[PDB]
């Protein structure tokens, strides 16, 4: 089997991407944030504290003839950005782009943090990291991909995120029309439960490529590109007037600037992030200070190849017995 679904930016900055997901019978369609950095499929629901729902579409398990309470199961998650959610668990039928999993754990939120409430466009998350990170207790549950994998034509999914435009998540096949040149594959460590890999270096604008190993995670659920302070300083030094602002929480730059591109290495291959992908707009409405899309990972504890990087590529998440990651230009 295969599946193919369009993923759409939630706003004009590409702060996140939402993908429609069918849950239950009859189908209830929710727009979920596909997150290769976590491993829980959780949704706003009829059980969510009423004051914490503000415009989201909810899953109502009592209206699904295929929903079953997973007795005794609870979940609770905290994300790197400080947001969190928790609740109980149902199993139900879940379909993405025509690919159906029966008996998928659907984690129903009883509580969500303010950041989730305040974002009316995201109805929940669909985790695509390794199932070892799933938070359901006392019996850990499998991701949608893990459940689908054996049935797929090939045990892969691909992320093709757009810049200020829709893109695609495919399951079970590689669309050879969706990229240019070849896909370069690189090794993955699953030791921390992430799609963790090592970039071979970087360049700023038309500058020389610096060969250096940068360990990090391919994370569709993180907006920005978080890299070591040395790398980030080298980038922003090429933007007149750019500076790190402790008050704002990262590098800012004059909105009048033209940003240089940023290249990262995948083996001997190179992925070029155009300068405009690194612009996250005014820090507050009407400001002429703009927020940068490349930020320091210092004190995150891990480098993160978030959407800023991934949207410059066609990305293969290869879930073979020994997983790997593939990157192509597009």
CATH at residue 18: 2.40.70.10
Q: How many domains does the chain have?
A: 2
Residue 129 and residue 193 in one domain: no
Query: Which helix or strand (DSSP H or E) is residue 87 part of?
Result: strand 84-96
Residue 186 and residue 162 in one domain: no
Residue 288 and residue 149 in one domain: no
Residue 115 and residue 260 in one domain: no
Residue 83 and residue 143 in one domain: yes
Question: Exposed/middle/buried for 258, CB within 10 Å: 0-12, 13-18, 19+?
Answer: exposed
Q: Which residues pair with 266 in a beta bridge?
A: 269
Lookup: tokens for 221: 């659920």
Of 150, 174, 198, the position where a domain reaches its end is 174
Of 119, 142, 174, the position where a domain reaches its end is 174
Backbone angles phi, psi at 76, to 5 degrees: -165, 125
Instruction: Tell me which residues are annotated as active site.
Output: 35, 199
Distance in angstroms (rounded) separating the CA atoms of residues 268 and 309:
17
Residue 170 and residue 183 in one domain: no
Residue 24 and residue 130 in one domain: yes
3-state secondary structure of 239: coil
Residue 91 and residue 201 in one domain: no
- How far is the CA of 311 from the CAs of 5, 52, 322, in angstroms? 16, 31, 25
Question: Exposed/middle/buried for 145, CB within 10 Å: 0-12, 13-18, 19+?
Answer: buried
Q: Which residues pair with 108 in a beta bridge?
A: 43, 88
C-beta of residue 136 within 8 angstroms of C-beta of residue 40: yes
* Terminal C-alpha separation, the chain: 25
Residue 179 and residue 203 in one domain: yes
Experimental method used, please? Answer: X-ray
Domain membership of residue 148 as a residue range: 5-174
Sign of CA dihedral 79, 85, 90, 95: negative
């Amino acid at each position: 089997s295969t599946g193919s679904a369009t993923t759409t930016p939630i706003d004009s900055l590409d702060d996140a991407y939402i993908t429609p997901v069918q849950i239950g019978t009859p189908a209830q369609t929710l727009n979920l944030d596909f997150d290769t950095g976590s491993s829980d499929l959780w949704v706003f629901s009829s059980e969510t504290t009423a004051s914490e729902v503000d415009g989201q579409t909810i899953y109502t398990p009592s209206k699904s003839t295929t929903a079953k309470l997973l007795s005794g199961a609870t979940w609770s998650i905290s994300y790197g950005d400080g947001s969190s959610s928790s609740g109980d668990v149902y199993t139900d039928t879940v379909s993405v782009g025509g690919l159906t999993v029966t008996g998928q754990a659907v984690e129903s939120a009883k509580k969500v943090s303010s950041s989730f409430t305040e974002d009316s466009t995201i109805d929940g998350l669909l985790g695509l990291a390794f199932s070892t990170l799933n938070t359901v207790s006392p019996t850990q549950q499998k991701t949608f991909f893990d459940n689908a994998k054996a049935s797929l034509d090939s045990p892969v999914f691909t992320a093709d995120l757009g810049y200020h435009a829709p893109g695609t998540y495919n399951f079970g096949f590689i669309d050879t029309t969706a990229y240019t040149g070849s896909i370069t594959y690189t090794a993955v460590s699953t030791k921390q439960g992430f799609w963790e890999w090592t970039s071979t270096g970087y360049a700023v604008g038309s500058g020389t490529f610096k060969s250096t190993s940068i360990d990090g995670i391919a994370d569709t659920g993180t907006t920005l590109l978080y890299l070591p302070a040395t790398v980030v300083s080298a980038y922003w030094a090429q933007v007149s007037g750019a500076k790190s602002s402790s008050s704002v929480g990262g590098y800012v730059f004059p909105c009048s600037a033209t940003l240089p591109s940023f290249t990262f290495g995948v083996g001997s291959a190179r992925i070029v992030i155009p300068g405009d992908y690194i612009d996250f707009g005014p820090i507050s409405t009407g400001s002429s200070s703009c927020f940068g899309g490349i930020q320091s990972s210092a004190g995150i504890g891990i480098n993160i190849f978030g959407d800023v990087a991934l949207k410059a590529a066609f990305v293969v998440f290869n879930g073979a017995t020994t997983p790997t990651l593939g990157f192509a230009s597009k």
